[PDB]
Amino acid sequence: LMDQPYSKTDFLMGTVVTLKIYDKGKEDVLDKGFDRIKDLAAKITTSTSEVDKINEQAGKKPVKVSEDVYYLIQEGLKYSENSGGSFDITIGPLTSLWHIGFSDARKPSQAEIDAVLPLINYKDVKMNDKDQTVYLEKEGMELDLGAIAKGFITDETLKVFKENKVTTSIIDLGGNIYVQGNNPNGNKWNVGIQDPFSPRGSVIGKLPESNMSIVTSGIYERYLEVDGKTYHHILDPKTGYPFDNDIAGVSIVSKKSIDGDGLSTATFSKGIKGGMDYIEQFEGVDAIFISKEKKVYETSGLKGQFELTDKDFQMD
Ligand SMILES: Nc1ncnc2c1ncn2[C@@H]1O[C@H](COP(=O)(O)OP(=O)(O)OP(=O)(O)O)[C@@H](O)[C@H]1O
Ligand SMILES: [Mg+2]
Ligand SMILES: [Mg+2]
Ligand SMILES: [Mg+2]
């Protein structure tokens, strides 16, 4: 293992992506990782991808998809059902309307919202295993896989690393982290817990981890502000507006990055106390929640592990 890793940085899917590999002789795996990231991003992004092709044929015909996309949609339907539909991969018509985080983000009229709410229904995604097709049952429906895309891609990048016998690495997609192995000095990696009140990279504390995903989500990262009100990017498919509760941010610790990514989006529907109860139901998944008044909460699996360092915040 090297003390200084091989490192490469790119800007993909709207975010800074850095991969680091500490195994000597594995420098070319960085390009293999980035190749896989670019491959997947092109298939699933709606910003003509495979997801675009499914959407174009909604209510018309099933669309053939590659194995990557069939799998991601399969998993998205599970996160959708498990959340009671508060997470819904058919939220596309609504997230396309607001377009939060893009230069043309807009608060739509209530009429525009009422026109898209009847289109949101994960049960109207029809999957055919033998043909490997996806069909949206109603015209106007749109898939949006954005709430699990980065986690899935992180998991698939790790798969490439392991296929190349990488043992010790850090995968960073815009502040969402997977740490493989341990620090070359033998200690567990000290993983920052993101400060939702500051840009990605600023932290409120640290958590030692090894072979683990630590994702982060915060409502102040890319919101639209208009006429004195703010609208963040995590939308309620039952109302058409962003979730409105006490969560400012949440970090989820789990073995698989896609689980952290999907469950984070799902917990935003439940608030801090309800979201903690939800995470206490998933074995091997834990969370740090941060309220709008800078109180910090930890689920049972993290007590005594997380160290709060920012004095502007308080454990509660
Ligand atoms: N209720 C929802 N169900 C499913 N997908 C959603 C929902 N609300 C928003 N999305 C889509 O998921 C995208 C990413 O949301 P997610 O909650 O994963 O962001 P994040 O984790 O806070 O940010 P980042 O991915 O940059 O770290 C949104 O931009 C939107 O396209
Ligand atoms: Mg995400
Ligand atoms: Mg995230
Ligand atoms: Mg997510």
Automatic annotation (TrEMBL):
Localization terms from the record: Cell inner membrane
Residues engaged in binding AMP: S86, D88, D144, R222, L235
Residues binding FAD, per UniProt: M13, S86, D88, D144, K150, S217, R222, L235
Binding positions (Mg(2+) 3): A147, D261, T265
Membrane association type: Lipid-anchor
Binding of Mg(2+) 2, residues: A147, D261, S264
Record-listed ADP binding positions: S86, D88, D144, K150, H233, L235
Residues where Mg(2+) 4 binds: N176, T216
Cofactor(s) essential for the protein: Mg(2+); Mn(2+)
One GO location term (cellular component): plasma membrane
Domain of life: Bacteria
InterPro entries linked to this entry: ApbE (IPR024932), ApbE-like_sf (IPR003374)
Primary localization: membrane
Enzyme Commission (EC) number: 2.7.1.180
Record keywords, A-Z: ATP-binding, Cell inner membrane, Cell membrane, FAD, Flavoprotein, Lipoprotein, Magnesium, Membrane, Metal-binding, Nucleotide-binding, Signal, Transferase
Residue numbers binding Mg(2+): A147, D261, T265
Alphabetized GO MF terms: ATP binding; metal ion binding; transferase activity
Note on cofactor: Magnesium. Can also use manganese.
Residue numbers binding ATP: S86, D88, D144, K150, N176, R200, S217, R222, L235, T265
Record function comment: Flavin transferase that catalyzes the transfer of the FMN moiety of FAD and its covalent binding to the hydroxyl group of a threonine residue in a target flavoprotein.
Family of the protein in this entry: Belongs to the ApbE family.
Name by which UniProt lists this protein: FAD:protein FMN transferase
Lineage, uppermost ranks: Bacteria, Bacillati, Bacillota, Bacilli, Bacillales
